[PDB]
Amino acid sequence: AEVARAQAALAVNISAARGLQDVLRTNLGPKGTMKMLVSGAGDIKLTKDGNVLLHEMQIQHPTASLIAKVATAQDDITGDGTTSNVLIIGELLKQADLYISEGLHPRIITEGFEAAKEKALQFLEEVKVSREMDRETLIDVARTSLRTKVHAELADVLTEAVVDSILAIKKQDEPIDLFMIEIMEMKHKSETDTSLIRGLVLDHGARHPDMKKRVEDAYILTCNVSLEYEKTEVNSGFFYKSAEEREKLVKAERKFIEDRVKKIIELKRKVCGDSDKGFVVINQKGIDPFSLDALSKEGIVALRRAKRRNMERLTLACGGVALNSFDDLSPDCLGHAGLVYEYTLGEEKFTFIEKCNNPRSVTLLIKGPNKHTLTQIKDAVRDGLRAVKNAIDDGCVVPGAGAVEVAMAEALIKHKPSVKGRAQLGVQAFADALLIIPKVLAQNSGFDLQETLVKIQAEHSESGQLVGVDLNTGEPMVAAEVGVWDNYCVKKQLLHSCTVIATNILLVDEIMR
Template identity: 65%
Template sequence: MSAAQLLNPKAESRRRGEALKVNISAGEGLQDVLKSNLGPLGTIKMLVDGAGQIKLTKDGNVLLREMQIQNPTAVMIARAATAQDDICGDGTTSVVMLVGELLKQADRYISEGLHPRIITDGFELAKIEALKFLDTFKLEKEVDRELLLNVARTSLATKLNATLAAKLTPAIVDAVLAIYQAPAKPDLHMVEIMKMQHRSAADTALIRGLALDHGARHPDMPKRLENCYILTLNVSLEYEKSEVNSSFFYSSAEQRDKLVESERRFVDAKLKKIVELKQELCGNDGKKNFVIINQKGIDPLSLDVLAKNGILALRRAKRRNMERLQLICGGTAQNSVDDLSEEVLGWAGLVYEQTLGEEKFTFIEEVKEPKSVTLMIKGPNQHTIAQVTDAVRDGLRSVYNMIVDKSVVPGAGAFQVACAAHLKSDAFSKSVKGKAKWGVEAFADALLIIPKTLAANAGLDIQDALAALQDEYAEGNVVGLNLETGEPMDPELEGIFDSFRVLRNCVASSASIASNLLLCDELLKARQMGRAGGPGPGMDGPNDHISNMASYDSDSSDGEFEETNVLLGYASKDADDDTISRLGGTPDWLDPENAPSAAYARCKVCKDLMVLLLQVNGELPERFPEHDRRLYVFACRRETCRRREGSIRALRGLFEQLQQPV
């Protein structure tokens, strides 16, 4: 009997060899799902949610975040891989592939009697040496547009088809270069990604300015203006009610007109100052124009006044766009109209509005300094736009990584082949003593999963392609795999580069995850993570046990649930059949004909409704204290919610305690 079962006979656990098999099979299973996505010739997966929404993607990050993964080991690997994307912007599929292959290679040696600790020691030595080798293998380069084009194209080609990747690459590189001001790092938040369901994905374009997802709210306002002064405001240009709740009464039409006039007096005074500034700067010749972008509201009467004076006004602009406007157009956002002058205004060469169906877009271009730009992503449908958006984000991060690291790594599997050969070379293998050398060899073999999978996804013979790469590298050439011919090629000449940062994190995180999983010798089914568990059955008196469960699953527990205080009659007997059968039958004291009232509340974990499984008012046996005689037990109705199982276990324990003889 294990220690966990000694403490709690009902504990669910998996020990030693069985736990190791569970972890290894989970890693291999997740690897099998994602390996067909790797590389430019990888396949596409279709994700369909419960509402029937479709998403087509080959991005490992999207797949791991949105797939329903139930195996706990696979969930752990998926979280680590998505963390790789958060840090580096790419490499999620590679992490999953490498973790799965490390576990597979380790299983080969474990089945021959080698202890997992020895293998993990070898993994650690191999990881340290691989990172040292990566530092010598990388190519240090200065920031150059042609190099950035190759880096972005390599990243995009793994997410999109080659033709579309080639068309999007210049837009992505130019977007980053526009906001890049050496020696500071580029701020990718200054690249706005706007989506427009229109035409095809190949029409995605870079706008060296700002695109707003709304237009003017008055039909008579101009749709296209050149040589524009830009006034950014955070001023309300609409009638606002007073903070004091008051009423006014009038007895004649004249008094009503005076009341309306007094209400408009403050807004009209603001409008007058704006119109006077426009007349002073622009005149009436039409060579210069005036645009207002306001973060607050503009009422219809104010819009009418501005339209009559030829002013284009946009209201309720987003705050982040207000900040970008000041960066690209100049000027200063104003919280008042009292001190308006030419110095506080920005400038744009062209402002125009485009209507697409029922949506309006306003474009501000030909600005002074495009320190912020917009990538307008187009596509015929939503899932195409989503696919392109994910690829563009990865492309932006790849360019960012190259600018920050000022180095790249030859791609197409070149690093993996070279590193595997280095780990198996006499120069390094002689420095590894003892059985740990088998862990190093397993690590070296696992690295080759990347070129093997690239060859398999291209329809090539895996062994022939790998042998050709290894033979060529043995002659002193750095080579990658040409996926069209299956022959070795020079990645640097072909312009195929991997990100140094992505590879470094991929090697380090994969080795750490695989080592932790190999050293896991027992799986235990735990209580809720982050919540202190109450004592198990038999460890305290029955009164303490019931009190703990009441505080754990009652409607007053730590604000875990929002009680709606809505009582919906009696719970039907059929609604509770599943729960009662899982509890081992109906207890004597629970009368099915007089089922407890069914209250509903909202589960904060999954936002679904949960049902009151049990409501006891004064029906508990006399041996329980008075404060325990009023008890509620809730359970979430969603089967995958972690609150459901906890509630069932607590209710089962309560039933057992109640059925004990006095």
């Protein structure tokens, strides 16, 4: 058919990106906002985080495909910077644009970049200082990594709970939290909130006065497939070989229910000795009223509807083995939660599996009556969880609020890449994308992304001072004192995911449809 070539294909590329990018620039720091997102489903989503906006919907361009790619990098590889990663490239693109606006090769200006990124990486090592993984040292990173991602006040209460979650570790040291994430969204009088609740929490537990709400000594038979069949890890018919056989099973189906409670009432006394130790069958389907009562009446807690995750985290948490049957099991495999506690909050029971024998799994209780509030608060958590988890995995920490970038753009002082000056321009180009965080904020916040940053620049050129645009009012300060300190996992990776995709479009002279 047709194609596009020369700078015509290039113009479509570089324009579509920076046409999409500044749309995303509306949000960063706390002075960013929460961008309304409605995908084909019709749900409104408000996110200052990149991955949501990037991976849901896009104004469709050939560039819109690569942007989520390196967006699939930042959140994956780090989780802090998804908001920050986008704003870097087009600021660098408009720079390089100038050089090819002058006219030049996108190839020679390509070679003018990555060294500067490699430089800044060096410079990032240089300017940063390794910092404590201490809880309160994390806070200044925690708020910021959250706050660069999501708005302050949410990030502020998240600063507490996220650190409380990432400090909950057994010293399983990760960039993210897999197990520390157990999210319980609850309809509540609090529309945006997250409650930290330790230990594995079960999707539900069953009510009955004889059924113990408090199990401190738990022998947990994980229970999935219901009372209604004998020794069955899956519910299926023992009958229905003809038309009238349909009636016979349900006539004999109530038998297995009593057979099954018979197993559990004895398996308690088998394993637990007397009934003082609550024998825990968490029945991940509904417990039939008779055995619901008769397990209650025997002291067994028959818990209604845990999760497959609450089955696997149980295998983790309780240090015991799960099962898909209620069958009598050897007392060994039965899980032990140092606390099995059914917790009715609102009308809903959330059964704590606590004293996790592997407390890498904790639980967050999310709050809202309105899902649009309840979704958004859930969203701000986890992108900041792994962000602040990049705080406590990192003994190195990089000070935020433009402290380190003026330590690059100025210390990139040119003719160090003197050869063609294309690097001297490319590093200059790269130097100019560094300050987008000092830019976007003094942009979003008061004064000017420029007239404040000149102080930042100046005040950094002053006394080598760590200095930066406020995340809040957009005025100069000392960013080291403020404590705004970016994850050491962000900075390096934040650079890589930029210049690698910033390299591609330059070498792309061609597009065809």
